[PDB]
Amino acid sequence: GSHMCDAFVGTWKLVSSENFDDYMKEVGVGFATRKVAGMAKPNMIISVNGDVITIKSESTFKNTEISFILGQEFDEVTADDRKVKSTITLDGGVLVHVQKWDGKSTTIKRKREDDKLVVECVMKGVTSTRVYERA
Numbered sequence: 770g771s772h773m774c775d776a777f778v779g780t781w782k783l784v785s786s787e788n789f790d791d792y793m794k795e796v797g798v799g800f801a802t803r804k805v806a807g808m809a810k811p812n813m814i815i816s817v818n819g820d821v822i823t824i825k826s827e828s829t830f831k832n833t834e835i836s837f838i839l840g841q842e843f844d845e846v847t848a849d850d851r852k853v854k855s856t857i858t859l860d861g862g863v864l865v866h867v868q869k870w871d872g873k874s875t876t877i878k879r880k881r882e883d884d885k886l887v888v889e890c891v892m893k894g895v896t897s898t899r900v901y902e903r904a
């Protein structure tokens with residue numbers, strides 16, 4: 770039957786980005802990767818099978834995939850090639866994705882708002898908002 774994470778499932782396309790270069794700088798992404806990753810217009814494909822959530826991200830820059838169970842840490846290699854330890858939870862309808870590496874932390878929050886899936890990436894005081902719509 771239904772689950773609350775149902776509203777995330779589907780194929781989503783990036784429609785706007787704000788402050789992503791500055792977020793990438795805060796994370797430590799180098800110049801060339803910032804330029805190429807910032808140019809990307811990813812699709813994000815979200816599916817659920819039992820307790821396992823899969824999020825794919827596909828662009829001309831990189832194709833990545835993670836599968837995970839809520840609350841259960843996993844190792845992730847990010848599109849910019851960080852080796853992080855990640856935990857994803859639901860918090861009041863928001864998917865909260867925390868990445869830890871080298872004594873640093875960044876959080877990506879994903880929520881449904883109207884017909885959008887809004888992705889907020891935060892590193893210290895810097896936030897980037899990336900808006901996706903159904904493909």
Ligand SMILES: O=C(O)CCS/C(Nc1ccccc1)=C1/C(=O)Nc2ccccc21
Nearest residue numbers: 793796798806824826835847848849888899
């Ligand atoms: O999706 C967006 O438009 C914004 C986030 S891109 C992303 N980081 C990231 C950070 C710096 C440079 C390039 C990419 C992701 C990451 O680190 N883990 C993910 C799992 C699923 C989907 C995306 C990401």
